[PDB]
Design an enzyme around this catalytic site. Structure first.
Site, PDB file in Angstrom:
ATOM      1  N   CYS A  52      18.281   8.365  40.877  1.00 12.94           N
ATOM      2  CA  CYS A  52      17.472   7.335  40.165  1.00 12.94           C
ATOM      3  C   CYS A  52      18.372   6.160  39.999  1.00 12.94           C
ATOM      4  O   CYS A  52      19.400   6.092  40.705  1.00 12.94           O
ATOM      5  CB  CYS A  52      16.856   7.878  38.836  1.00 12.94           C
ATOM      6  SG  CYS A  52      18.095   8.547  37.629  1.00 12.94           S
ATOM      7  N   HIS A 104      11.789   5.148  42.025  1.00 19.76           N
ATOM      8  CA  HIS A 104      11.513   4.018  42.874  1.00 19.76           C
ATOM      9  C   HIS A 104      12.735   3.268  43.316  1.00 19.76           C
ATOM     10  O   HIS A 104      12.867   3.056  44.551  1.00 19.76           O
ATOM     11  CB  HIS A 104      10.514   3.036  42.230  1.00 19.76           C
ATOM     12  CG  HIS A 104      10.331   1.788  43.030  1.00 19.76           C
ATOM     13  ND1 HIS A 104       9.759   1.801  44.285  1.00 19.76           N
ATOM     14  CD2 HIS A 104      10.776   0.523  42.825  1.00 19.76           C
ATOM     15  CE1 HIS A 104       9.794   0.573  44.797  1.00 19.76           C
ATOM     16  NE2 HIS A 104      10.412  -0.220  43.933  1.00 19.76           N
ATOM     17  N   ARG A 133      21.719   2.363  41.494  1.00 22.62           N
ATOM     18  CA  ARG A 133      22.085   1.054  40.956  1.00 22.62           C
ATOM     19  C   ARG A 133      23.572   0.965  40.525  1.00 22.62           C
ATOM     20  O   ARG A 133      24.130  -0.144  40.328  1.00 22.62           O
ATOM     21  CB  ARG A 133      21.232   0.696  39.729  1.00 22.62           C
ATOM     22  CG  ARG A 133      19.766   0.324  40.153  1.00 22.62           C
ATOM     23  CD  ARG A 133      19.033   0.295  38.775  1.00 22.62           C
ATOM     24  NE  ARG A 133      17.669  -0.091  38.906  1.00 22.62           N
ATOM     25  CZ  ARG A 133      16.653   0.292  38.131  1.00 22.62           C
ATOM     26  NH1 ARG A 133      16.743   1.245  37.176  1.00 22.62           N
ATOM     27  NH2 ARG A 133      15.474  -0.179  38.468  1.00 22.62           N
ATOM     28  N   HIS A 172      33.650  24.568  38.158  1.00 22.27           N
ATOM     29  CA  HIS A 172      33.499  25.068  36.830  1.00 22.27           C
ATOM     30  C   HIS A 172      32.106  25.568  36.455  1.00 22.27           C
ATOM     31  O   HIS A 172      31.998  26.548  35.715  1.00 22.27           O
ATOM     32  CB  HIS A 172      33.874  24.013  35.766  1.00 22.27           C
ATOM     33  CG  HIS A 172      35.342  23.663  35.713  1.00 22.27           C
ATOM     34  ND1 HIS A 172      35.832  22.667  34.875  1.00 22.27           N
ATOM     35  CD2 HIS A 172      36.433  24.194  36.341  1.00 22.27           C
ATOM     36  CE1 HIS A 172      37.168  22.619  34.992  1.00 22.27           C
ATOM     37  NE2 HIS A 172      37.548  23.511  35.891  1.00 22.27           N
TER      38      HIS A 172
END
Lengths: 155, 155, 154, 153
Positions: free
Chosen positions: A71, A13, A115, A104
């Protein structure tokens, strides 16, 4: 021209607010890249593992070649996605991590935090991730095969 | 007084240079914590997934409650460790990620990059990880349980 | 087609990486020459004495660029920017390295040895030295405003 | 005693100016934000806001500044051109704390394009709440910075 390389995209969200940015960044990596948005379609409450799982399953069957998961911090997406065999999901927070995950570990999913990381750095992450080839080196391939043996040993 | 809480530590070759730092930083998180070094014993070549697996198996059995993994960037360790059921390994690069991987994801392994993150920040990461409790909130637990349902769906 | 000189200084914690910083300047390309001005020894030092040495070299144009390292990079950036003509950028990743050039025509890059691992310090140095200034009028205008702030206190 | 915090932005960081005002208040009831930044979404040049805030701090009208631009760096270069200012580019908790502890920094500069808002919040809170060490070696270094400024005045 090109082979179409599909890139599945999912969010939670708080990162739904940048889902259109993620779509755009994927296209900016190159005209061969085609975003497939699998994320939440609205601002409703969601649980990140459900979208990590949707993306990661597509990646593991190679219905798409790459995934992008976003997220709050990227961490939850990286933990959930890596639970799918065949997935190598990298939490990236800068150019260096974006490139090195490719070079790698031949990573196939890039996980970012809405955030934590500002959008121009998310942009740079996605584009770097999708432009950077794997190194091709014996030791890297050997390490990746060792991850596969860890998965096989718990299947 | 206290319950002893063991913390297993593992590295690859570049992060073997900081393995004594890692041991120290785990003790600085509090006198209940006891480091268990499982990483390479010398400067010999190693493959990170061998040490990720060792630490991750210890955590998954609860021979130790937490793990600390270090490699070049942290990313390989996180991908590998998360292939073990029961593990929730977080790639942390700052205080915020260290805290949030505990608060939201109840993470049990912290993964750091010796080539990416300076030692005083690695210190702050370890200490913060080990002092921060899990939030307890219904939505976080529910998500963590969905991670376990991902693992069970591939077992 | 002169080479491009790059003065380098450190404090005491970053003295541990002074050889890496010389190397990474060289890895940015054969046109870049490092000029090490930092502490020669692991003695106690105060960062502003080395910031000032590098920054004065840049402001007089004895070198084109500077590289400063300390614990976090922040000390160096505060000190160096007190020399007129210096635009000293604390950089911690590729984006900051590049954008300090593109937008601010930065002439000194500051990095932290306690905060930033050496391979990202390498990337920062190489990006800083290789990236050109945008040339765009709005950036030039802002940089001229910075000079107007220095002149209003000269 | 009220600890006042002047705040300025450029155009991209105008988008989070309400965040910045909030996070200052979240550091404690004694912290009061004084918003000096652009009032609308119009074009602006960061050095004009850097200069505004930095002069307030240097003349002791407010104890602290907060400056935000794309990356934080423009603000920190501009603000530090004002004598008495110690403006610190901060991108995480460690940098926010150590800028106070070692350099008694009085302005915190942050990037809106680079750093997500919840980290910006942590940065601001930590910066405002962390005290200067008071140790002799830190005070000596800070006085060396003043001597650099005095040598060019």
């Amino acid at each position: 021209s090109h082979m179409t390389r599909r890139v599945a995209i999912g969010t939670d969200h708080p990162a739904f607010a940048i889902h259109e940015n993620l779509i755009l960044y994927v296209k900016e990596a190159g005209d061969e890249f085609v975003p497939v948005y699998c994320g939440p379609k609205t601002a409703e409450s969601v649980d990140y593992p459900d979208f990590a799982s949707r993306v990661a399953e597509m990646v593991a069957r190679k219905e798409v070649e790459f995934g992008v998961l976003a997220c709050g911090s990227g961490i939850g997406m990286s933990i959930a996605a890596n639970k799918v065999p065949g997935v190598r999901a990298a939490l990236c927070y800068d150019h260096y991590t974006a490139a090195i995950s490719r070079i790698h570990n031949d990573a196939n999913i890039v996980c970012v935090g809405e955030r934590t990381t500002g959008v121009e750095v998310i942009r740079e992450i996605i584009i770097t991730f999708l432009q950077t080839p794997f190194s091709g080196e014996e030791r890297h391939a050997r390490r990746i095969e060792k991850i596969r043996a860890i998965e096989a040993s718990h299947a």
